[PDB]
């Protein structure tokens, strides 16, 4: 296969030459002309209490008022953030859960973990109580992330080093995605629900399309595991959080990565990231117990959600972008405005 | 809440009942302890696809044992989710502080030798130990 390898190297050289003809600078090198956000002050406006273990994931409803969250006490809670009212409480199949999703119509929630099964629960039934609607089985390794496409399709990734697109009523896989040498940790749903980005413990991520079952590109440049990934709601970027003490932002049409966010006091990895509804406040959690509210266009400034005394697992903003929730190992959801 | 309306009282009462149920559930939860079995495990698995979660009791204390006897590779989210265990029975960035009880025939490591009900009794003792020091670390007494 000498000819094939040589032609692959020639294609790589062509790609690099095309890169050099267009790449000149970065966002954080030209966007400096925008007025820095400076010191921003955030404060708790509510404090959602009731979880009694480490909280691993939270997720907003689309109305921007209801919230689902999961904690390692094998429990899944739906909250009213306006009045601190608890709306629903679901006891799970087993403790070792890792991910949450909400249905953008409001009728369903789906969870998963080590037991190699993705569970799906119906909220709005005529019996006046929640019950398990489906259990998708067929993966062999632990399940990492899950995001509804609509009331009838879901997508998961697992320790199998594979991803799978599923149809809920049938109960059988309708698409499968292979090509990872290491365990996949998370993936992100696009705004239009037609493209996915999935990062894996091989210092790389991959772009997938549901209708094709074949990747378009792979992203590399980190040094260690990838625990966090999310989008920029324009649909043209996604931000990665690694265990090499760095966050990066990757672009799709640039054939590279856009931004790098790091500091020396971060001798640890990034537990989670998330975006601002307009695209000006990036949020990151750490093992240094802080939540840094990084800026995006300036790569230097920051704020803090000081008030957490343990590790910050998960943080997310609404669709109207007026509040922010953080769940942490301290077992408290904190609402910030 | 005299400012509220008629139905906010019903919503508040519902949230308070949910709180009550959560509290009772967590209170009954917080007692059971955890043993990560790896591998004298042959008699252990019988005296006390994927991985096996099992539940038993001993001496009025409720044990959960997790068997990963096929996991001989590097742990990505096994070892991150295994931070919450009180004893690793044996026959990185996470387990540099977890007591490793060891059977034959900071990270304190024991050794025991064994009709053979000791297989259980031994580890039971370790349980108490691996808890006691922790609580002393809370009271500044050690």
């Amino acid at each position, epitope marked *: 296969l000498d000819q094939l390898r040589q032609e692959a190297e020639q294609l790589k050289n062509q790609i690099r030459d095309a890169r050099k003809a267009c790449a000149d600078a970065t966002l954080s090198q030209i966007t400096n002309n925008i007025d820095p956000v400076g010191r921003i002050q955030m404060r708790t406006r509510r404090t959602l209490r009731g979880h009694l273990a480490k909280i691993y994931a939270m997720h907003w409803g689309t109305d921007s*008022r*209801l919230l689902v969250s999961a904690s390692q006490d094998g429990k899944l809670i739906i909250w*009213d953030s306006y009045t601190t*009212n608890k*709306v629903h409480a679901i006891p799970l199949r087993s403790s070792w859960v890792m991910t949450c999703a909400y249905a953008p119509s409001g009728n369903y929630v789906a969870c998963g973990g080590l037991d190699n099964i993705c569970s799906i629960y119906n909220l709005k039934t*005529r*019996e*006046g*109580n929640v019950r398990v609607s489906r259990e998708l089985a067929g993966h062999t390794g632990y399940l990492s992330c899950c995001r509804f496409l609509d009331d009838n399709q879901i997508v998961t990734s697992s320790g199998d080093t594979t991803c799978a697109l599923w149809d809920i009523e049938t109960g059988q896989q309708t698409t499968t995605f292979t090509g990872h040498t290491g365990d996949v940790m998370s993936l992100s749903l696009a705004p239009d629900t037609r493209l996915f980005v999935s990062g894996a413990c091989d210092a790389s991520a991959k772009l997938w399309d549901v209708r094709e079952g074949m990747c378009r590109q792979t992203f590399t440049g980190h040094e260690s595991d990838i625990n966090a990934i999310c989008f920029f709601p324009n649909g043209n970027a996604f931000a990665t959080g690694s265990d090499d003490a760095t966050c990066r932002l990757f672009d799709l049409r640039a054939d590279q990565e856009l931004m790098t966010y790091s500091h020396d006091n971060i001798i640890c990895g990034i537990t989670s990231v998330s975006f601002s509804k307009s695209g000006r406040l990036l949020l990151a959690g750490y093992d240094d117990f802080n939540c840094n509210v990084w800026d995006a266009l300036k790569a230097d400034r920051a704020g803090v959600l000081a008030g957490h005394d343990n590790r910050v697992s998960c943080l997310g903003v609404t669709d109207d972008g007026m509040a922010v929730a953080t769940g942490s190992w301290d077992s408290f959801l904190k609402i910030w405005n | 809440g005299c400012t509220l*309306s*008629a*139905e906010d*009282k*019903a*919503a508040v*009462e*519902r949230s308070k*009942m949910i709180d009550r149920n959560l509290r009772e559930d967590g209170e009954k939860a917080a007692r059971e302890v955890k043993l990560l079995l790896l591998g004298g495990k042959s008699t252990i698995v019988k005296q006390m696809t994927g991985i096996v979660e099992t539940h038993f009791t001993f001496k009025d204390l409720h044990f959960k044992m997790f068997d990963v006897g096929a996991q001989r590779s590097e742990r990505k989210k096994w070892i991150h989710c295994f931070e919450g265990v009180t004893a690793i029975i044996f026959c990185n960035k996470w387990f540099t502080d977890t007591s490793i009880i060891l059977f034959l025939n900071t990270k304190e490591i024991y050794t025991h030798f064994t009709t053979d009900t000791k297989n259980v009794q031994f580890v039971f003792d370790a349980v108490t130990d691996v808890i006691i020091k922790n609580n002393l670390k809370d009271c500044g007494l050690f």
Partner: single-chain antibody, 231 residues
Framework: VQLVESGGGLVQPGGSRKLSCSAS????????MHWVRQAPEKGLEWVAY????????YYADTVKGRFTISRDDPKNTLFLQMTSLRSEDTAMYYC??????????????WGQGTTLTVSSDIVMTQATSSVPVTPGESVSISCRSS???????????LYWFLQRPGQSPQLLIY???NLASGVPDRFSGSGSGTAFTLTISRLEAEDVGVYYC?????????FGAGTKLEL
């Protein structure tokens, strides 16, 4: 979903009596209940309320002290006690299922009622008594509120129900804007504070009976005179 009432009949003047209801097909514990009255020739009239949890119980200003309400979750049963019955108590009596969290539908399932024969407050005003209609013709009904039922959060606790001949009432609209499950689309209706109007589009069939508007903004729960249609 089934609720079955019982304990009805005829009683001589003076004494006391009992009513009961048995439920089947839903999680009885997560619901509160209402007892509701209807006169043999007149409109509806609320009786009493029991809450999910048993911590709250509400009665009416007209027979307070004479009645009481209770529930039993282990068996999924509802009970009503009444004493010292006078002539003004002869009526039909219904039980209603209700639930309150953020976004639920209350008053959405009515039982079938039983007979019982014996030998300040906000005012809702129904516009008229009867309106002649023809098939396929758009219809409109209106009632008036003596107070601004609307609230600083957006709620407005006015309800729209329908009663076909020989049947039980059926929820049509809750909080004066929201359609219920299992109802056609052709029903609608809106309004502004103190003035509300139900609209029916393309009257087809099985829409003959009496229409009612209720309020829930504070206890007691008051009804209007009613509005019947003929065809």
């Amino acid at each position: 979903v089934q609720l079955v009432e019982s304990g009805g009949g005829l009683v001589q003047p003076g004494g006391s009596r009992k009513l009961s209801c048995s439920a089947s097909g839903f999680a009885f514990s997560s619901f509160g209940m209402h007892w509701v009255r209807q006169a043999p020739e007149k409109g509806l009239e609320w009786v009493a309320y029991i809450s999910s949890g048993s911590g709250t119980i509400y009665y009416a200003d007209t027979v307070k002290g004479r009645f009481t309400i209770s529930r039993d979750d282990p068996k999924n049963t509802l009970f009503l006690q009444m004493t010292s019955l006078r002539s003004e108590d002869t009526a039909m009596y219904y039980c209603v299922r209700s639930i309150y969290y953020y976004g639920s539908s209350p008053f959405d399932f009515w039982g079938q009622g039983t007979t019982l024969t014996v030998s300040s407050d906000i005012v809702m005003t129904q516009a008229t008594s009867s309106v002649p209609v023809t098939p396929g013709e758009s219809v409109s009904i209106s009632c008036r509120s003596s107070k601004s039922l609307l609230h600083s959060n957006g709620n407005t606790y006015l309800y729209w129900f329908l009663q076909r001949p020989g049947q039980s009432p059926q929820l049509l609209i809750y909080r004066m804007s929201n359609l219920a499950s299992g109802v056609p689309d052709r029903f609608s209706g809106s309004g502004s504070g103190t003035a509300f109007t139900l609209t029916i589009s393309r009257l087809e069939a099985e829409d003959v009976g009496v229409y009612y508007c209720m309020q829930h903004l504070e206890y007691p729960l008051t009804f209007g005179a009613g509005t019947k249609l003929e065809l």
